[PDB]
Design an enzyme around this catalytic site. Sequence first.
Site, PDB file in Angstrom:
ATOM      1  N   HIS A   1       0.815  -1.237   0.000  1.00  0.00           N
ATOM      2  CA  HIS A   1       0.000   0.000   0.000  1.00  0.00           C
ATOM      3  C   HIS A   1       0.833   1.265   0.000  1.00  0.00           C
ATOM      4  O   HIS A   1       0.304   2.332  -0.338  1.00  0.00           O
ATOM      5  CB  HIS A   1      -1.063   0.085   1.111  1.00  0.00           C
ATOM      6  CG  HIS A   1      -2.088  -0.993   1.147  1.00  0.00           C
ATOM      7  ND1 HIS A   1      -2.972  -1.190   0.102  1.00  0.00           N
ATOM      8  CD2 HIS A   1      -2.422  -1.821   2.167  1.00  0.00           C
ATOM      9  CE1 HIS A   1      -3.760  -2.179   0.486  1.00  0.00           C
ATOM     10  NE2 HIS A   1      -3.466  -2.589   1.722  1.00  0.00           N
TER      11      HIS A   1
ATOM     12  N   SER B   1       4.514   1.897   8.397  1.00  0.00           N
ATOM     13  CA  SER B   1       4.098   0.851   7.471  1.00  0.00           C
ATOM     14  C   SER B   1       5.292   0.403   6.625  1.00  0.00           C
ATOM     15  O   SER B   1       6.096   1.233   6.207  1.00  0.00           O
ATOM     16  CB  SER B   1       3.018   1.385   6.554  1.00  0.00           C
ATOM     17  OG  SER B   1       1.936   1.877   7.343  1.00  0.00           O
ATOM     18  N   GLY B   2       5.440  -0.901   6.406  1.00  0.00           N
ATOM     19  CA  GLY B   2       6.555  -1.393   5.622  1.00  0.00           C
ATOM     20  C   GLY B   2       7.812  -1.740   6.402  1.00  0.00           C
ATOM     21  O   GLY B   2       8.703  -2.427   5.882  1.00  0.00           O
TER      22      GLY B   2
ATOM     23  N   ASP C   1       0.210  -7.819   1.908  1.00  0.00           N
ATOM     24  CA  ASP C   1       0.649  -6.426   1.849  1.00  0.00           C
ATOM     25  C   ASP C   1       2.160  -6.282   1.844  1.00  0.00           C
ATOM     26  O   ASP C   1       2.761  -5.673   2.753  1.00  0.00           O
ATOM     27  CB  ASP C   1      -0.012  -5.613   2.965  1.00  0.00           C
ATOM     28  CG  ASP C   1       0.200  -4.121   2.860  1.00  0.00           C
ATOM     29  OD1 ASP C   1       0.515  -3.637   1.753  1.00  0.00           O
ATOM     30  OD2 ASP C   1      -0.019  -3.429   3.877  1.00  0.00           O
TER      31      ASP C   1
HETATM   32  N1  LIG Z   1       0.723   0.799  10.328  1.00  0.00           N
HETATM   33  C1  LIG Z   1      -0.099   1.530  11.110  1.00  0.00           C
HETATM   34  O1  LIG Z   1      -0.229   1.258  12.287  1.00  0.00           O
HETATM   35  C2  LIG Z   1      -0.853   2.692  10.600  1.00  0.00           C
HETATM   36  C3  LIG Z   1      -0.818   3.008   9.302  1.00  0.00           C
HETATM   37  C4  LIG Z   1      -1.678   4.219   9.127  1.00  0.00           C
HETATM   38  C5  LIG Z   1      -2.020   4.992   8.021  1.00  0.00           C
HETATM   39  C6  LIG Z   1      -2.853   6.113   8.207  1.00  0.00           C
HETATM   40  O2  LIG Z   1      -3.162   6.867   7.044  1.00  0.00           O
HETATM   41  C7  LIG Z   1      -2.209   6.980   5.960  1.00  0.00           C
HETATM   42  C8  LIG Z   1      -2.801   7.574   4.677  1.00  0.00           C
HETATM   43  C9  LIG Z   1      -3.443   6.736   3.745  1.00  0.00           C
HETATM   44  C10 LIG Z   1      -3.953   7.280   2.554  1.00  0.00           C
HETATM   45  C11 LIG Z   1      -3.776   8.644   2.256  1.00  0.00           C
HETATM   46  C12 LIG Z   1      -3.092   9.479   3.157  1.00  0.00           C
HETATM   47  C13 LIG Z   1      -2.896  10.946   2.832  1.00  0.00           C
HETATM   48  O3  LIG Z   1      -1.663  11.411   2.612  1.00  0.00           O
HETATM   49  O4  LIG Z   1      -3.863  11.687   2.772  1.00  0.00           O
HETATM   50  C14 LIG Z   1      -2.589   8.929   4.355  1.00  0.00           C
HETATM   51  C15 LIG Z   1      -3.312   6.412   9.524  1.00  0.00           C
HETATM   52  C16 LIG Z   1      -2.956   5.610  10.643  1.00  0.00           C
HETATM   53  C17 LIG Z   1      -2.119   4.496  10.410  1.00  0.00           C
HETATM   54  N2  LIG Z   1      -1.611   3.556  11.257  1.00  0.00           N
END
Ligand SMILES: NC(=O)c1cc2cc(OCc3cccc(C(=O)O)c3)ccc2[nH]1
Length: 228
Positions: free
Chosen positions: A41, A183-184, A89
């Site tokens: 992702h 993430s990753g 993922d």
């Molecule tokens: N691995 C984790 O614990 C975790 C991942 C994660 C990701 C999150 O949103 C990331 C995101 C996704 C799509 C678009 C945007 C943007 O730039 O608008 C930002 C929030 C909490 C989270 N926690």
Amino acid sequence: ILGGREAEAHARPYMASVQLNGAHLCGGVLVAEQWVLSAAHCLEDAADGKVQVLLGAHSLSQPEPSKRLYDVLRAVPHPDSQPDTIDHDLLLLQLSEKATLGPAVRPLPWQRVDRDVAPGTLCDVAGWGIVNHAGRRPDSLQHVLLPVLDRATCNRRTHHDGAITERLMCAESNRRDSCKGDSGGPLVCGGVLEGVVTSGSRVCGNRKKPGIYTRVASYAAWIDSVLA
Ligand SMILES: NC(=O)c1cc2cc(OCc3cccc(C(=O)O)c3)ccc2[nH]1
């Protein structure tokens, strides 16, 4: 990382920052001289945008003799990954050349035997992800030691309600957790890579919603196939 501490500079020589247009996007882990493993992702909607991998880093912004930014020859997401699921993922990034190895840049051994990590095992997760609810981004690598949570508890209705397959694992998320930007990255247990932080949106540091990590041992044949 929420509720963690600044990591010891260069003590995790496998730690990668996957970057998009020169800014940290996701964590990653050096698994071979020319390959970084991360989350699928992270690559979503990044088309055209320039993906690079920063190795040997502690600070994202400051000069360090061991820091080297590598371009990416190939980005290989797992073929069964999908935008609306947490399954499969994984992402493999082939660097433009083999990384220069040394005390600050070295691949991490990774788990090939498909057996679960025992509940209660203390594992380490590191990253440059957000450190608070306001979204503060640290300049330096952070880490946290988290105990592995048994899959049955993780799958309870109050937790992840059946979403945790045999290919996934969980760790406790009580005030200490991975978060956006982590993430990753790697979940390391007893010096061996066991998991990769998932990249689906989730609350951080809430004990009711454990951290979810992809089990690398469950994808050993895919990792081998891509490198071959
Ligand atoms: N691995 C984790 O614990 C975790 C991942 C994660 C990701 C999150 O949103 C990331 C995101 C996704 C799509 C678009 C945007 C943007 O730039 O608008 C930002 C929030 C909490 C989270 N926690």
